[PDB]
Amino acid sequence: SLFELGKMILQETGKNPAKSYGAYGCNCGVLGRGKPKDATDRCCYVHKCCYKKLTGCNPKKDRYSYSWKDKTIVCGENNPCLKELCECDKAVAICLRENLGTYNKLYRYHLKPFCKKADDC
Amino acid sequence: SLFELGKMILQETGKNPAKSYGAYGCNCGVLGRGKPKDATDRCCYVHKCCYKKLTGCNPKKDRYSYSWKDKTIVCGENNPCLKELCECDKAVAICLRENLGTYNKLYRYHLKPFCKKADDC
Ligand SMILES: O=C(/C=C/c1ccc(O)c(O)c1)O[C@H](Cc1ccc(O)c(O)c1)C(=O)O
């Protein structure tokens, strides 16, 4: 769920996830996907496509178990859908941290309704 | 949908809705409800309660028509679900504006995991 996803982004990036990524670019936060603005935005595009393919569980609300071990996110077995979800969320937290160097505050709180249309996943 | 909601908040408040209201208090933005921290937060609590009566339309995804007449939000006769949805969004936009006087930036990007459990609507 968003609880686990936001915790992971905090553990990986050291950043408040809502402030930094609740509405960044065309793909981070609410409101679907759009052509990515930059590498950080592209992380969130891949993440939304990761969710789109999952079936059997709800990426928004379903909770799941994960551990922080040796400063690594380790997804608990859970059940297969929840483990795939934990893996989508892990991957985005890692991707966002990797791309902090080009994060651009201009795209924060971005105007999404003006975003170009996204290619299909 | 979130597009119409965001636009109404912008028109009423003159604030960027993602920045001011995307993660405010225990009730504004993602997740559910919780005990409200202040008046602005309580507007969002009322709004989430409003959405729970909706039958036959998705408050997040479903578009509907409204217009800005004499600096007033005017819901279009949509069908019954969408008109109610439009009325819910209008009311929260007005309430947020009416309570800008006590808006506290400290509640922005709040820790919503520790919010106390909401009372029944
Ligand atoms: O563990 C953390 C954060 C650890 C952390 C805090 C600040 C940092 O910069 C950092 O890299 C890691 O917060 C959790 C609480 C929490 C925060 C965000 C959430 O979405 C959540 O579900 C739980 C805790 O107290 O264990």
Residue numbers in the entry:
A (entry chain A), B (entry chain B): 1 to 13, 15 to 53, 57 to 61, 67 to 88, 90 to 123, 125 to 127, 129 to 133
Which sentences did the original study use to describe this structure?
Phospholipases A2 (PLA2s) are the most abundant proteins found in Viperidae snake venoms and, in addition to their well-established ability to hydrolyze lysophospholipids in a calcium-dependent mechanism, these proteins can display toxic effects by different mechanisms. Despite their lack of enzymatic activity, Lys49-PLA2 myotoxins play a key role in myonecrosis, given that when they are selectively neutralized, most of the muscle-damaging effect of whole venoms is prevented. The muscle membrane-destabilizing activity exerted by Lys49-PLA2s has long been attributed to the presence of basic and aromatic residues situated at specific positions in the C-terminal region of these toxins (residues 115–129 according to the numbering system adopted by Renetseder and colleagues). In this work we report structural and functional studies concerning the mechanism through which RA neutralizes the in vitro inhibitory neuromuscular effect and muscle damage caused by PrTX-I, a Lys49-PLA2 from Bothops pirajai snake venom.
Crystals of the PrTX-I/RA complex diffracted X-rays to 1.77 Å resolution. The crystals belong to orthorhombic space group P212121, with unit-cell parameters a = 49.4 Å, b = 67.0 Å and c = 85.5 Å. Calculations based on the protein molecular weight indicate the presence of two molecules in the asymmetric unit. The homodimeric configuration adopted by Lys49-PLA2s has already been demonstrated by different techniques and is assumed to be the biological assembly in this study. The crystal structure of PrTX-I complexed to RA shows that the inhibitor interacts with the toxin at the entrance of its hydropohobic channel, demonstrating for the first time a ligand that interacts with this region of a Lys49-PLA2. Considering the mechanism proposed by dos Santos and colleagues, this finding suggests that the inhibitory effect of RA is the result of a steric hindrance that blocks the access of substrates to the hydrophobic channel. The fact that only one RA molecule was found to interact with the dimeric structure of PrTX-I can be rationalized by the presence of a PEG4000 molecule in the second hydrophobic channel, presumably arising from the high concentration of PEG4000 in the crystallization buffer combined with the high affinity of the channel for hydrophobic molecules. The blockade of one hydrophobic channel of the toxin (protomer A in this structure) by RA molecule occurs when the inhibitor interacts with atoms of both protomers, however conformational changes are observed only in the C-terminus of protomer B. The present data show that RA significantly reduces the blockade of indirectly evoked muscle contractions induced by PrTX-I by up to 90% and inhibits the muscle damage caused by this toxin in isolated phrenic-diaphragm preparations by about 80%.
